Amino acid sequence: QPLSVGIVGGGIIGVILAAGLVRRGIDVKVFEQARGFREIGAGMAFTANAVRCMEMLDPAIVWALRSSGADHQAEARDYLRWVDGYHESSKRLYQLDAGIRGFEACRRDQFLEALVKVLPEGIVECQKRLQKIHEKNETEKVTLEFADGTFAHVDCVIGADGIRSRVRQHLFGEDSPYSHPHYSHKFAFRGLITMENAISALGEDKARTLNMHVGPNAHLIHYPVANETMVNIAAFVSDPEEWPDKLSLVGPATREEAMGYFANWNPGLRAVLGFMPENIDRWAMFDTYDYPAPFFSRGKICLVGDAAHAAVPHHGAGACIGIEDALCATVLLAEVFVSTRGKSSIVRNRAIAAAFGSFNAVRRVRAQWFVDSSRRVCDLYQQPEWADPQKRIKAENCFEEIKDRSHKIWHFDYNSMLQEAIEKYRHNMGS
Amino acid sequence: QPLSVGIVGGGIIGVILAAGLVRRGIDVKVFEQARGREIGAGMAFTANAVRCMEMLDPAIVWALRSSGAVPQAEARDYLRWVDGYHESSKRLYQLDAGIRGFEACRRDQFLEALVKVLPEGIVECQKRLQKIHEKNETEKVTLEFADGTFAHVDCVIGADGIRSRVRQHLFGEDSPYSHPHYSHKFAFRGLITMENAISALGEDKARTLNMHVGPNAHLIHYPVANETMVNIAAFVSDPEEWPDKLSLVGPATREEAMGYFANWNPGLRAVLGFMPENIDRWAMFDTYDYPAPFFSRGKICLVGDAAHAAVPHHGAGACIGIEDALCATVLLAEVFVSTRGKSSIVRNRAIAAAFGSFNAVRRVRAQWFVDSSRRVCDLYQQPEWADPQKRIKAENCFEEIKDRSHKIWHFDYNSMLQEAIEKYRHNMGS
Ligand SMILES: Cc1cc2nc3c(=O)[nH]c(=O)nc-3n(C[C@H](O)[C@H](O)[C@H](O)COP(=O)(O)OP(=O)(O)OC[C@H]3O[C@@H](n4cnc5c(N)ncnc54)[C@H](O)[C@@H]3O)c2cc1C
Numbered sequence: 043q044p045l046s047v048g049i050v051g052g053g054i055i056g057v058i059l060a061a062g063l064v065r066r067g068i069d070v071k072v073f074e075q076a077r078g079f080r081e082i083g084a085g086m087a088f089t090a091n092a093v094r095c096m097e098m099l100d101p102a103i104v105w106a107l108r109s110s111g112a113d114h115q116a117e118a119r120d121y122l123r124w125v126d127g128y129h130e131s132s133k134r135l136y137q138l139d140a141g142i143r144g145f146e147a148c149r150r151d152q153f154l155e156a157l158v159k160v161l162p163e164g165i166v167e168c169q170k171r172l173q174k175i176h177e178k179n180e181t182e183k184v185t186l187e188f189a190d191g192t193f194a195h196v197d198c199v200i201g202a203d204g205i206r207s208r209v210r211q212h213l214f215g216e217d218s219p220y221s222h223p224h225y226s227h228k229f230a231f232r233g234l235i236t237m238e239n240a241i242s243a244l245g246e247d248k249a250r251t252l253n254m255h256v257g258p259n260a261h262l263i264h265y266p267v268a269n270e271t272m273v274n275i276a277a278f279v280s281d282p283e284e285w286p287d288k289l290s291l292v293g294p295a296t297r298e299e300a301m302g303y304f305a306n307w308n309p310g311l312r313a314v315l316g317f318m319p320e321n322i323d324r325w326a327m328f329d330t331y332d333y334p335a336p337f338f339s340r341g342k343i344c345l346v347g348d349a350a351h352a353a354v355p356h357h358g359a360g361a362c363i364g365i366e367d368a369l370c371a372t373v374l375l376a377e378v379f380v381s382t383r384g385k386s387s388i389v390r391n392r393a394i395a396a397a398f399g400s401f402n403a404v405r406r407v408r409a410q411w412f413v414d415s416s417r418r419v420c421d422l423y424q425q426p427e428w429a430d431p432q433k434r435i436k437a438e439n440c441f442e443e444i445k446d447r448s449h450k451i452w453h454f455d456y457n458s459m460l461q462e463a464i465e466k467y468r469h470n471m472g473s
Numbered sequence: 474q475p476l477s478v479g480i481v482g483g484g485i486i487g488v489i490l491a492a493g494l495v496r497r498g499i500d501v502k503v504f505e506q507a508r509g510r511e512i513g514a515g516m517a518f519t520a521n522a523v524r525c526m527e528m529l530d531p532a533i534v535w536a537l538r539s540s541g542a543v544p545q546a547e548a549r550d551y552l553r554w555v556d557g558y559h560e561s562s563k564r565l566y567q568l569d570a571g572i573r574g575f576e577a578c579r580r581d582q583f584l585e586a587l588v589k590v591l592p593e594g595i596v597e598c599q600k601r602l603q604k605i606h607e608k609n610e611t612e613k614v615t616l617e618f619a620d621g622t623f624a625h626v627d628c629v630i631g632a633d634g635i636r637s638r639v640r641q642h643l644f645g646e647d648s649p650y651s652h653p654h655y656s657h658k659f660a661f662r663g664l665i666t667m668e669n670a671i672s673a674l675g676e677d678k679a680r681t682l683n684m685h686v687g688p689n690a691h692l693i694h695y696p697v698a699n700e701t702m703v704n705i706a707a708f709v710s711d712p713e714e715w716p717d718k719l720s721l722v723g724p725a726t727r728e729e730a731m732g733y734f735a736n737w738n739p740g741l742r743a744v745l746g747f748m749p750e751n752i753d754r755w756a757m758f759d760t761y762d763y764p765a766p767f768f769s770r771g772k773i774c775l776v777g778d779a780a781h782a783a784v785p786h787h788g789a790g791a792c793i794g795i796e797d798a799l800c801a802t803v804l805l806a807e808v809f810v811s812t813r814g815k816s817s818i819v820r821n822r823a824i825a826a827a828f829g830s831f832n833a834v835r836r837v838r839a840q841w842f843v844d845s846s847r848r849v850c851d852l853y854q855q856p857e858w859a860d861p862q863k864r865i866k867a868e869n870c871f872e873e874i875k876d877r878s879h880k881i882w883h884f885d886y887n888s889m890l891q892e893a894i895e896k897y898r899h900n901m902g903s
């Protein structure tokens with residue numbers, strides 16, 4: 043008596059969830075609206091904790107990760123570094139050791155392609171944009187209606203459909219503000235410079251490592267790419283205005299626009315912006331902070347990843363939080379699968395809803411904390427006090443909070459989460 | 474290039490190990506002497522070993538659960554002990570292992586399902602290892618088979634069971650350390666119908682797992698085949714040596730078994746009377762008298778029964794082997810990622826450093842377990858079970874059985890892996 047899951051969204055979280063479920067004998071379909079891959083060329087990095095979670099989902103996921111990234115001596119340790127970007131002192135302010143392979147980086151689209159190759163053929167169906175969800179009785183299948191006029195029927199539905207999730211809209215009502223992300227009043231300029239130019243502006247040490255330059259109402263992060271031949275720039279600035287509804291969240295911008303937000307900053311940082319191409323990109327940062335989900339699941343429908351808890355990217359770990367979701371959901375549905383073998387339709391479908399209730403109970407606090415924490419650390423990166431020389435010691439005390447919040451992300455006890463999830467599932471079943 | 478592993482032996486541990494390694498991108502060959510296999514018996518895994526299997530590859534647990542029968546609230550797994558020697562048949566002790574504290578399967582169906590999980594081209598049958606040729610750490614290890622063929626691999630794992638040839642290579646064919654030895658106990662095995670089991674024992678015992686204790690022997694039974702049959706294993710003491718090259722399995726009669734239990738209570742004597750006229754006798758050998766001085770040397774490592782074969786009185790010997798497989802897999806995956814773009818000298822040094830960490834972190838628990846398996850049997854078979862005036866002493870054994878059982882079932886495999894990785898890095902000069 044086999045259990046079928048309809049995953050809406052074939053991004054990194056939906057495909058990782060599919061891989062975990064299928065390796066456990068669960069019948070999975072992934073419905074993706076797009077015709078192929080997106081985010082061509084972008085990099086991302088995963089904490090060691092998230093990588094262990096990937097291994098538990100399916101060790102082949104980690105093989106795919108390590109196939110999708112990058113001499114003797116010793117093993118390198120991964121550091122985060124903060125630098126004063128406003129004053130000419132330009133002095134190193136803080137650093138955090140994450141350890142050997144404390145982060146593992148890849149090219150996003152290459153990783154996603156390698157993951158699709160891990161799945162059995164046919165799991166992912168493209169050009170399948172969810173339009174409407176039709177729920178009947180718990181003992182009946184959930185029907186998914188796509189924009190192309192087709193339908194699919196599954197025992198349960200997972201929304202892995204990202205920041206503008208259609209599954210979320212179904213749950214809360216397409217007119218509810220809770221169904222939609224909102225603007226964080228910050229946007230980012232993104233572009234590259236050559237490593238040669240990066241060294242001119244910053245020196246070899248900074249040019250070849252990851253650094254965040256803090257200051258008043260803005261901040262800049264850079265790190266090397268393409269085999270240390272270029273350096274990727276992200277400059278985040280404050281925007282007092284609204285982002286107009288239906289104005290695209292990505293648009294073209296000029297080097298000189300970015301330069302103007304950093305005119306009072308120190309020269310090395312200004313030089314970095316000066317070395318970017320004339321034409322760069324502007325990215326609005328939206329999230330689920332203002333109207334956080336009242337629940338991640340209801341009935342036989344569950345949200346995971348950015349659909350549940352899209353965050354602004356100031357911890358660099360939003361996907362890591364989604365991989366935790368995918369592990370939790372996978373372990374739960376496999377327990378539904380084994381524990382209801384031989385039982386009636388009524389019992390199996392009650393078990394699905396019981397497991398999804400446990401998922402919500404176990405994940406929602408950490409996930410929504412993380413969304414709050416991503417805004418908070420950005421505020422600390424951007425303190426107005428960084429410019430006020432009468433307040434550079436209160437400003438510099440933020441770093442103990444940054445450490446504690448980072449460690450809370452990086453040192454997650456996922457085995458306790460899974461234990462708590464199984465016990466809450468069993469409790470919800472009257473045991 | 475990738476890292477290649479030659480696994481000698483395609484039993485449950487060798488195939489589970491292969492599954493873990495290949496899912497991490499390591500190049501594996503499994504060399505099995507037999508033509509192609511296992512026996513129809515059932516076996517059970519602790520919840521802890523099942524979690525270890527999942528970490529190797531979740532499909533291993535899928536194979537397990539699809540290779541075992543289908544069971545309103547969820548049953549907890551209990552171990553139960555009964556007095557076999559007095560018509561009292563009193564219930565002496567019980568341990569609660571929780572929901573799916575054990576998961577059972579048929580060995581032959583599990584192994585076949587596992588081979589289907591592996592990619593094609595991994596398992597090579599009729600490959601009986603005859604000799605290992607080691608050279609410099611930086612050269613491949615050469616395996617020579619009885620059919621005159623050869624294989625060349627970066628490192629060798631002996632998963633070749635209780636009469637391991639890899640073990641004989643390490644210690645020498647004339648060393649007692651190269652061979653298992655007799656525990657001076659053997660088992661009668663057979664089946665009866667559940668109807669007959671109910672008649673002899675009552676329905677509650679007939680339908681549950683029970684161990685009947687008594688002087689110098691003991692008997693375990695449990696239901697099989699979806700509660701239509703009951704499997705019987707009756708262990709007795711043998712003061713004689715087992716002739717060296719006499720086979721360890723052989724034919725026997727129900728009357729022979731009945732004689733060993735003639736003084737035992739009637740229900741249990743009836744169980745034996747209900748067996749078929751012809752049954753099997755299994756000699757119990759292990760590595761207790763001459764345990765391995767090391768599980769690994771250079772680029773050769775032992776796992777499973779090749780490292781630490783035990784007599785079966787904890788019902789968890791393969792569980793210990795699965796821990797081995799997990800440890801070796803995690804170590805070799807760390808060799809693979811940490812030496813990715815380094816020289817052959819470094820990669821081969823790392824293999825040896827990994828196998829050295831394996832030995833350092835696994836040998837104590839595994840050799841403790843072989844001794845424990847004999848010890849609990851001594852407790853099940855105390856002479857004092859015969860004497861009603863010594864009952865307090867005899868029943869006092871169950872706290873030690875509980876301690877030993879929990880040490881097996883509650884193993885901290887995550888700390889073991891952290892320790893293995895730390896010892897590997899230390900061995901590499903960091
Ligand atoms: C600049 C930036 C940098 C980041 N860097 C990191 C990092 O280094 N490490 C990290 O952990 N996280 C990082 N994150 C966060 C991370 O990218 C996200 O958390 C992650 O992409 C969420 O994955 P997802 O599958 O939930 O959603 P998505 O990646 O948004 O995928 C959703 C999928 O659903 C499809 N879809 C949408 N609607 C429908 C529909 N109606 N029907 C069918 N399909 C639909 C979409 O086409 C898409 O493919 C970063 C985020 C940003 C913005």
Ligand SMILES: Cc1cc2nc3c(=O)[nH]c(=O)nc-3n(C[C@H](O)[C@H](O)[C@H](O)COP(=O)(O)OP(=O)(O)OC[C@H]3O[C@@H](n4cnc5c(N)ncnc54)[C@H](O)[C@@H]3O)c2cc1C
Nearest residue numbers: 482484485486506516517602633634777778789790791792
């Ligand atoms: C009656 C009994 C009941 C048991 N019940 C349980 C239980 O319930 N739960 C549990 O965890 N454990 C149980 N065990 C222990 C368990 O059976 C063993 O630990 C397990 O089989 C060990 O597996 P292995 O792969 O190391 O060795 P084996 O199963 O012995 O496999 C070794 C393989 O290596 C091959 N081989 C041998 N020599 C060579 C050679 N020169 N070249 C190539 N191939 C070779 C062999 O043909 C064989 O296929 C029980 C044991 C017994 C005797």
Ligand SMILES: [Cl-]
Nearest residue numbers: 355358359360
């Ligand atoms: Cl992020």
Ligand SMILES: [Cl-]
Nearest residue numbers: 785788789790
């Ligand atoms: Cl055993």
